[PDB]
Amino acid sequence: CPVNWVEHERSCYWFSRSGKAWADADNYCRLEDAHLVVVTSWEEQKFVQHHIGPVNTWMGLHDQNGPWKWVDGTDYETGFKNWRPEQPDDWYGHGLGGGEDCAHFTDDGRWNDDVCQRPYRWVCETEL
Amino acid sequence: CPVNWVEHERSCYWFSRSGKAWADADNYCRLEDAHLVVVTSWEEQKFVQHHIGPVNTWMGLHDQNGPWKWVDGTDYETGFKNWRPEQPDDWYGHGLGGGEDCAHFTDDGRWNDDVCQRPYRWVCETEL
Ligand SMILES: OC[C@H]1O[C@@H](O[C@H]2[C@H](O)[C@@H](O)[C@@H](O)O[C@@H]2CO)[C@H](O)[C@@H](O)[C@H]1O
Ligand SMILES: OC[C@H]1O[C@@H](O[C@H]2[C@H](O)[C@@H](O)[C@@H](O)O[C@@H]2CO)[C@H](O)[C@@H](O)[C@H]1O
Ligand SMILES: [Ca+2]
Ligand SMILES: [Ca+2]
Ligand SMILES: [Ca+2]
Ligand SMILES: [Ca+2]
Ligand SMILES: [Ca+2]
Ligand SMILES: [Ca+2]
Ligand SMILES: [Cl-]
């Protein structure tokens, strides 16, 4: 793993300490030949939770193009899920335009779909 | 005034129904040969409040370059102000990077400084 990245179970993680809109966070990870974090197990979810704390934080999961997709091609429907109860809900009520297309960890670790324009911290991941 | 714009006191106003980061909203208004709204009296403040309702909404006021400046050159210190109590405060505690450099109307119409990348509705203004 590069300097300032954390090794965990054959992956390297980088935890931002500033916010970006989802698309810009996604681009940032690509610059590092990485991708927004893809969570595939309870063990990994806990690890990530442990390092982000109770803070809204972008992950590599979205439905901007139709169905839910992980940024690295990992299959959504057969994959791990940790949504907050009553999420995802594609809420339009924020009034910012559109529903909600981008997933983030919430303050309790569980996932919510939110407006992709929102600035949140993010996590990059690469595999060893 | 152009179609879809509201005339008031020799100005034309356009009220968004979607959200943008401050710099994106600024670009949007400049595109229309307009500017993010510049509020210079109680009457203008009340007119804007009436149209936007209890919704966080960007205006043409910022301190990205140092001192508070209105986007059209209107002098800040000698001009109308309507800050919430204990604002502006250049808060860093949102943890998104930096302080708070962009002003918006809040739900009671009074102003707050906030993180420029937040998507809020906005208002454009042109003078007849
Ligand atoms: O109302 C739909 C939105 O809910 C927001 O989550 C709420 C949550 O439902 C509530 O129980 C409490 O925890 O406050 C949250 C507001 O921050 C979602 O964040 C939003 O995406 C919509 O789903
Ligand atoms: O603590 C500094 C931040 O306050 C935020 O305003 C809060 C306010 O403190 C709270 O009492 C309640 O009214 O909600 C407000 C907004 O959610 C400002 O938005 C932020 O810019 C900082 O100044
Ligand atoms: Ca992973
Ligand atoms: Ca959606
Ligand atoms: Ca949601
Ligand atoms: Ca004006
Ligand atoms: Ca500031
Ligand atoms: Ca503030
Ligand atoms: Cl936001």
DSSP conformation letters of B43-77: HHHHHHHHHH-SS-EEEEEE-TTSS-EETT---ST
Enter the tokens of residue A43: 């063990």
Domain layout of chain B by residue ranges: 1-128
Listed in sequence order, the residues at least 6 apart from B107 whose beta carbon sits closer than 8 Å to its beta carbon are: B54, B55, B56
Q: Which residue of B has its CA nearest to A120?
A: B96
Please state how this structure was obtained: X-ray
CB contact under 8 A, B20 and A121: no
DSSP conformation letters of A34-83: -EE----SHHHHHHHHHHH-SS-EEEEEE-TTSS-EETT---STTS---B
Residue B86 CA, closest ligand 2 atom number: 23
- For this entry, resolution in Å reads 1.9
Distance CA A38, CA A52 (A): 15
The amino acid at A126? T
Contact predicate A13/A125, CB 8 Å: yes
Q: How far is the CA of B63 from the centre of ligand 7 (A)?
A: 5
CATH code of the domain made up of A1-128: 3.10.100.10
Distance CA B57, CA B121 (A): 5
DSSP letter assigned to residue B20: B
Contact predicate B48/B80, CB 8 Å: no
